[model samples]
Target: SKVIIPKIVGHRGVGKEGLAPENTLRSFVLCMERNIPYIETDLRVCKTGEIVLFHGTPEGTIPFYKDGTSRIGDLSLEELKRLDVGGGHTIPSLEELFVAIEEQKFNLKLNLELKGEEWKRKESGDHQRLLLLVEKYHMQERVDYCSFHHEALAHLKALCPDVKITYLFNYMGQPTPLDFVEQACYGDANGVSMLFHYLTKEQVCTAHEKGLSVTVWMPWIFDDSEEDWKKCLELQVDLICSNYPFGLMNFLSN
Candidate 1:
């Protein structure tokens, strides 16, 4: 059996730009209302040292205030509380997100992207917060803590050895080092992405040979056409991270 998981993951909790307002609490619930089974949220650190679900640097994206508000890392948790995420939406802390997930009782999954660039300075507290939060709620069963930074994965593994992680890729980087790839193999990655066209079937399959599951992001790099859609289905991928989840769902279900 192919397992046929939901083809639609709420991209950044419902595709940014006014759809559901990026990584806010309201977006998480709104996606659930649409029967979206899995939701993706970006992770960042706040000045007060809380792990919060927000994306893109807060610096210029948000309006100016007398004091200042830039980068999620630059502001305290209280300052973060004051900034609205459009439509009266409040920024949701990772702890808050966990509560929402439990409260909703919906058959949903979380793809928690570790915005690793936030920790280039290599602090340890943020990693500690992530571990404590998941364990506190007894949600070791759920959550995929994904990241592009290989070192970040190392840190994550150091914190909680059994957490599921997905090694994310961007187009600009060289193919990740084989040793790093093997490290994730030994870790708990569910899949790896080459961001389409950046890697080949050999790379994906080689990972599978090492006991890691395989998946790819689609349509962004391929044709967002019906023909390309059929090609992906024919490939029989383990998972499909697509912008058009509605379309992918129809294909996977049909």
Candidate 2:
């Protein structure tokens, strides 16, 4: 059962452009209600030494702060609780998300991508705390970890091998080895996530042969068109990650 990989993963808990605020409790609930097996969201370490769900750099996404508004990393969760973004939605801490899971009674799994300073940290500053929280909530089997960072995933794999980890790379040029697929398997990662455009049949199969799952992010905004969806299917990807999980569900049903 732990070998499972969902067919669709909600990117930031549904479309990032939709009515609701992204990386919030509400958006996540909506995905859970719709039976989305996995919801992908970003995590950052706040100044008060707690992990919270937030997107990007938090400059414009966090509109509550004004003029030399100080970094989100510099603000305490207590201070951030007073502030809200996108339709009166409060900034949600990692603990609050766990609470919401229990209260909502929705068995939704999470795909938490380490971002910002935590993403860059070689030591995985707050990521260790994430493992603690997972134990507190007994969610060890229910969460997946991902990151664009170079170091964290490998460190995390060493810490916990049961959890799934995806080493994310952009659509940019391939690094030193054209076939880093060999490196990912020989190394600690279990999956490789990348922008869909750069992935080829050979690459996808190479990963599959290495016992690595393929999770690819969409190239389109919101919903993917007919051809794009077909392309992903043709590549035989293990998971289709998109801002539109609802649409992904609908397309699969039809």
Candidate 3:
């Protein structure tokens, strides 16, 4: 009954897997080893001006931090590396992540969600520097970007004419198919990464009709919902992002 297999993006590396630390290179390694084609991770600019693979502000996304400070922008790369994010894994800068992929030439695609307000500026130095490194690694064709902040993605789009962006719909709100199309077109995103339970076949079909790709995901950082994952398959999304990638991959196999 299925003619096309939706691509899998391992959200935050292996993503809260029974084993592997989320957002760490170790998790990324395990994700690639399992042959997941794309991996999604958040980017935060640290004090020392380095892009680190992390999520949330005030660092709520950080798993195991004891210090009072939470914002990643205030923490130096040296300081961030000290916080153990479970399994003795620490924050790894984008340089290290890029180097690991380049050194091996793994061909694993990256979907980086830019966090913090700095990214929304017309010409953010952090955004410029991020592109600098992307060009340095000659990874312009390999990496795409996403963010709940449409303005940030818009700024990124203004910066790079050829950049690929997928606008993320906040899981809290439920939007109609037309609303999805309206925002996506307004943001000028290459695709729309919609949520699970609220998703409908008409939403998927409408997006397709407008020549926009449809990607579906859930609130995977906190929980895994197989019941909702089934809806993704039922609607035939172009991409499916999962925290426990293995589970989604297993679902696709069956």
Candidate 4:
């Protein structure tokens, strides 16, 4: 089957010193400046009930928010802004980021991952809020919703069938390619995102045959070898989330 080679999506900006922190407006703009056409970022809701561009919970080593227990859901947007991400960067609201995109008129695509298991709750209404933001920003065509929570994916599709959705499949206690494909089909999602190591050529081909796009996160870039990258390319995956977008593009081009 003929497939357009996947694009190298910037994973949370380049994260270089003197640049904006990951998931901030500055980082995204920098990606545009660097000519990276696509990016992957995380989304979470703040205590103020506003959606924000953030990755993990505050419950890990080197917590950024108020404390280890405080999460995006626990703090108001104002409170979240108080924490410095890096280079004096604060957390950015999803709306703010979209506005920046519109203002810059940068032609780019994004894989927006909905963070938190809260969305899986029946009354969370998080999906509804997200849809409104996407509509308000007029970014329906520019963004694809991705999440590890299959329930949220289903709700997203129900809310807007036109909205592109991707299922992020991580460890589910030993999953097979068939299981992944089935999940995509069940959710009526357009794509499936998995770690690079979990994917095989046969699995990729099978997904394409099933009419689903294959996206690999943390793509195999070991040894920085073009040959290794080419192996993934040969599978004809639809997209690659890479920390080094420029390098990946160069390798692909050469």
Highest-TM-score candidate: 3
lDDT of each residue in 1-254, candidate 4, tens digit only: 55467787878765332456777777888888877888888888787788888776333122754455566777778887777888677888988878888888678888898776577666577788989888888889999988777787777787788989988886442455467888788778888887766778888877888889888777323323356567778878888787666678778786
Best by lDDT: 3
The TM-scores, one per candidate, come to 0.81, 0.87, 0.90, 0.89
Candidate 1 per-residue lDDT over residues 1-254, each given as its tens digit: 44334255666665642565767777778778778777777788877889887766423234434444466667788878887666688777889988887887777778887775555346667777788898898778777777767668767777677877787765255665666467666656666654544555566557766667555554223434456556555554556555556555566666
Off by over 4 Å in 3: 57-63, 174-177
C-alpha lDDT of residue 236 in model 3: 83
Pick the winner on lDDT between candidates 2 and 3.
3
- lDDT for residue 73 in candidate 2, whole number 0-100: 82
Which window of 10 residues has the lowest lDDT sum in candidate 1?
A: 58-67
RMSD of each: 3.6, 3.5, 2.3, 2.8
Candidate 2 structure lDDT: 0.75
Clashing pairs in 3: 58-70
Candidates 2 and 4 compared by lDDT, better number? 4
Clash counts per candidate, in order, are: 1, 0, 1, 1
Q: What is the lDDT of residue 85 in candidate 2?
A: 72
Candidate 3 overall lDDT versus native: 0.79
Q: Summarize candidate 3's per-residue lDDT along 1-254 as a digit string, tens digits.
A: 34547898888898867767778888888777888999999888888888888875433444355444467777789989887776678889998988888877468999898875577767648778888899899889998888777788777777787888888885356564458788888778878887765678888878888878888775654465577567677788988888768988887787
Clashes of 2: 0
Worst 10 contiguous positions by lDDT, candidate 2:
56-65
Of the two candidates 3 and 4, the one with more favorable TM-score, higher being better, is: 3
